[PDB]
């Protein structure tokens, strides 16, 4: 029984979303622009970057055609907290191209909660 008026998901501000190949086990603020960002480099393939001393290779990934990305803070009333059309998809030692469940049991299931 959760409501979100279209004014939230309208004008809501742009967000940077990275998706890491590693699970940081507690949600929490984090100094991304101090530690991660300045590590990101560009090259002929996607991107390099470090995390915990492990080498990461990235690709930009576009939100499906006809769609739009939203960060919803589950608490209060749905409520779009930011917006995105694209996110960096980081992977380990390798770009991680072709397909893994990301760019595709397709992975993914039902929701409850």
């Amino acid at each position: 029984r959760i409501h979100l008026r279209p004014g939230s998901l309208r004008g809501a501000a742009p967000a940077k979303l990275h998706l890491l190949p590693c699970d940081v086990l507690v949600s929490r603020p984090a100094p991304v622009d101090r530690f991660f960002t300045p590590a990101v480099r560009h090259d002929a393939d996607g991107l390099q970057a470090s995390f915990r001393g492990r080498g990461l290779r990235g690709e930009e990934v576009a939100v499906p055609p006809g769609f739009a990305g939203f960060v919803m803070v589950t608490e209060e009333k749905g409520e779009g907290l930011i917006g995105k059309l694209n996110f960096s998809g980081d992977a380990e030692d390798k770009a991680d191209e072709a397909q893994e469940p990301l760019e595709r049991l397709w992975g993914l299931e039902t929701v409850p909660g």
């Binding site: 480099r41 915990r52 030692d93």
Partner: protein
């Protein structure tokens, strides 16, 4: 300026080298390789090569290198070898704390020893490519020289490669390279401290070696809950990982 002094770790590493002295393109030369920074959990590791005409070895043995000394005396002798750049050439590779971390912490394993040797292979490769008339190559090591020499002689099948466990006191060109490498590692850590200090950050870390409790304590006081350490820290060090497991959020990798 730092605009570019960021990407000393875009490539992850750095080769500095001298113009190759004319004599050393035609006369036979000896080539010493050695290193600094295998140990610290902090800073770059440095590999160096030195070379010079066989005819001019006397200027190293008989003169003043081979002859355990201080950070001061070391700085001077290297200015003498820099001075007579008429017949001694050199180059080093400065591998950064982070290339080191990322090499050893890849999904597919690559150790300190490999990483080091490769670098030593690469540096010797460079000097051939520069048309240095190299005939022998002495390489310093720690422990059993044999299988170090086995793989190094396989590669480079056209030059003699001697691998000695205390080569920096045996052959003068290995002794010199030892000093270039120690001097580069030191200039490389001072630069770091200057920049740390410049921005009112704490650069008081001790010896750099794990096991020296000042260094262990600096690491302790410097552990961001999500990201862990500053680039300065060899994340891949047994000691590094241990501290992070105690003082920073648990993260599961794709190593399922």
């Amino acid at each position: 300026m730092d605009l570019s002094e960021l990407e000393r770790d875009n490539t992850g590493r750095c080769r500095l080298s001298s113009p190759v002295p004319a004599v050393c393109l035609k006369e036979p030369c000896v080539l010493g390789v050695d290193e600094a920074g295998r140990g610290p959990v902090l800073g770059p590791m440095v590999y160096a090569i030195c070379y010079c005409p066989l005819s001019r070895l006397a200027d190293l043995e008989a003169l003043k290198v081979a002859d355990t000394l201080t950070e001061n005396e070391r700085e001077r002798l290297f200015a003498k070898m820099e001075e007579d750049g008429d017949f001694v050439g050199w180059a080093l590779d400065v591998l950064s704390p982070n290339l080191i971390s990322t090499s050893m912490l890849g999904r597919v394993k690559y150790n300190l020893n490999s990483l080091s040797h490769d670098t030593a292979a690469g540096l010797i490769q460079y000097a051939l490519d520069q048309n240095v008339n190299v005939t022998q190559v002495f390489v310093d090591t720690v422990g059993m020289p044999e299988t170090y020499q086995a793989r190094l002689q396989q590669h480079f099948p056209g030059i003699e490669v001697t691998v000695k466990a205390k080569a920096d006191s045996l052959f003068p060109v290995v002794s010199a390279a030892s000093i270039f490498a120690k001097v580069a590692r030191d200039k490389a850590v001072k630069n770091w401290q200057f920049v740390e200090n410049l921005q009112d950050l704490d650069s008081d870390y001790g010896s750099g070696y794990p096991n020296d409790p000042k260094t262990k304590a600096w690491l302790r006081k410097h552990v961001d809950p999500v990201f862990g350490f500053p680039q300065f820290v060899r994340f891949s060090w047994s000691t590094a990982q241990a501290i992070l497991e105690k003082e920073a959020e648990d993260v599961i990798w794709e190593d399922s």
